[PDB]
């Protein structure tokens, strides 16, 4: 997510541009398991910063 | 057994100048079917002179305005005007071009006066590499000015300018500017 803004809060100076970058990473796993076992598996150990979603395939 | 394009041979060419033969490449391993190869010649010294002479000559063809960066158009206008010189003369175009370069590459001209000085100019030897650079530049520029404001189109001015430079006709821009450079060299002793 490259987005570029002007450094100065005014118009004075040289053309200076902040180039802010946010990177988003995606993982997918597909399993053959009943919903109870998947639910038990998911909430066994997590660390803040990752978003986990369970979807029907 | 490599031939330029499809019919030009690289065994009938001879330098017979000894001055600029390592900076002209038509007979050695630098033989190829297409005057379009990009390459890394212009990224280091001692490697810029290994580019084939026809490759450099077609590289310097495009210039001015949108015409720059159209190397394929240069390949077309080089196969053209080369068919034209071969039909006009009947001789091998590569040897004619080498003759034009030998006749057009200046030998001596003026720069700054030795240790220091800028009021006037002092005559010095021209390197073979800079002289082939100058010869190619004059060839291209004379051709494009000959096309400039003229009824005749491209692939003609290249052809006639090259053939006059090979023969020495004053209508050639390359060798007339050559003689001009040596006249400045003489006048600035």
């Amino acid at each position: 997510l490259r987005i570029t803004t002007r450094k100065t809060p005014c118009g004075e100076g040289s053309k200076t541009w902040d180039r802010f970058q946010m990177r988003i990473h995606k993982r997918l796993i597909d399993l053959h398991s009943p919903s109870e076992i998947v639910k038990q598996i998911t909430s066994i150990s997590i660390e803040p910063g990752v978003e986990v979603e369970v979807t029907i395939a | 057994d490599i031939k330029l394009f499809g019919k030009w041979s690289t065994d009938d060419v001879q330098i017979n100048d000894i001055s600029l033969q390592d900076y002209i490449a038509v007979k050695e391993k630098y033989a190829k079917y297409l005057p379009h190869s990009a390459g890394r010649y212009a990224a280091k010294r001692f490697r810029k002179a290994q580019c084939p002479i026809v490759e450099r000559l077609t590289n310097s063809m495009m210039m001015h305005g949108r015409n720059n960066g159209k190397k394929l158009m240069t390949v077309r206008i080089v196969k053209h005007a080369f068919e034209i010189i071969h039909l006009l003369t009947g001789e091998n175009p590569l040897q004619v071009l080498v003759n034009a370069i030998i006749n057009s590459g200046p030998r001596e001209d003026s720069t700054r006066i030795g240790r220091a000085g800028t009021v006037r100019r002092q005559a010095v030897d021209v390197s073979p590499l800079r002289r082939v650079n100058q010869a190619i530049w004059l060839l291209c520029t004379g051709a494009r000015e000959a096309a400039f404001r003229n009824i005749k189109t491209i692939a003609e001015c290249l052809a006639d300018e090259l053939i006059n430079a090979a023969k020495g006709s004053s209508n050639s821009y390359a060798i007339k500017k050559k003689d001009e450079l040596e006249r400045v060299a003489k006048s600035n002793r």
């Binding site: - | 077309r76 053209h80 005749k152 003609e156």
Partner: protein, 72 residues
């Protein structure tokens, strides 16, 4: 007012168009248009007509760069 170059197949056009031109190896529309003082379009038309007459073989032509090669 306007510069005059012949846009018709005229007496000067018909003269030295099929007998003396092949004696010169350089056969291109610009040279013809300069020799007999016509436009480029008429020179291209004349070379196309003489090609259709089955006189001289073709080498190439993109839009206006056409090459004719003799046999003698």
């Amino acid at each position: 007012d306007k510069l005059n170059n012949l846009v018709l197949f005229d007496k000067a056009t018909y003269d030295k168009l099929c007998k003396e031109v092949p004696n010169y190896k350089l056969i291109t529309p610009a040279v013809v248009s300069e020799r007999l003082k016509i436009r480029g379009s008429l020179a291209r038309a004349a070379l196309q007509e003489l090609l259709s007459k089955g006189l001289i073989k073709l080498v190439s032509k993109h839009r206006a760069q056409v090459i004719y090669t003799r046999n003698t």
